[PDB]
Structure 1
Amino acid sequence: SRLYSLLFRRTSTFALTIAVGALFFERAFDQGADAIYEHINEG
């Protein structure tokens, strides 16, 4: 419940959480996928 009251209730903060999250999510997604591709293709 705290999160809603803190980062998801004020639209400005909603955007902030979205943008920040997206900033981190991507690199990771790329890494994970890339890694998987690599494990999947060992050569």
Structure 2
Amino acid sequence: VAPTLTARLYSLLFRRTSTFALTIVVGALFFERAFDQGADAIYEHINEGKLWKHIKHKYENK
């Protein structure tokens, strides 16, 4: 037997609230970045070539 993913997670990080906070601090960081990266991408896909990001080419450095 092994601990369910949760139980592993539990005994490594949540027993002590100090560890529990730490976790949350670090996940708040990591999560921001993926969310933004993913979420941004998603958005930018829906308006392909509509946004300057897509269009800076025309008048840029010749």
In the superposition, the TM-score normalised over structure 1's length comes to 0.88
What is the Cα-based RMSD across aligned positions, in Å?
Answer: 0.8
The superposition leaves residues 3-30 of structure 1 with CA deviations (integer Å, 9 ceiling, x where unpaired) of 1111011000000110111110001111
Extract unaligned runs of 5+ from structure 2. 1-6, 50-62
Q: Which structure exhibits the higher relative contact order, with contacts defined as CA atoms closer than 8 Å and separated by 6 or more residues?
A: 1
Runs of 4+ in 1 over 4 A off after TM superposition: none
Q: Which has more radius of gyration?
A: 2
Any stretches of 5+ residues in structure 1 without a counterpart? Answer: none
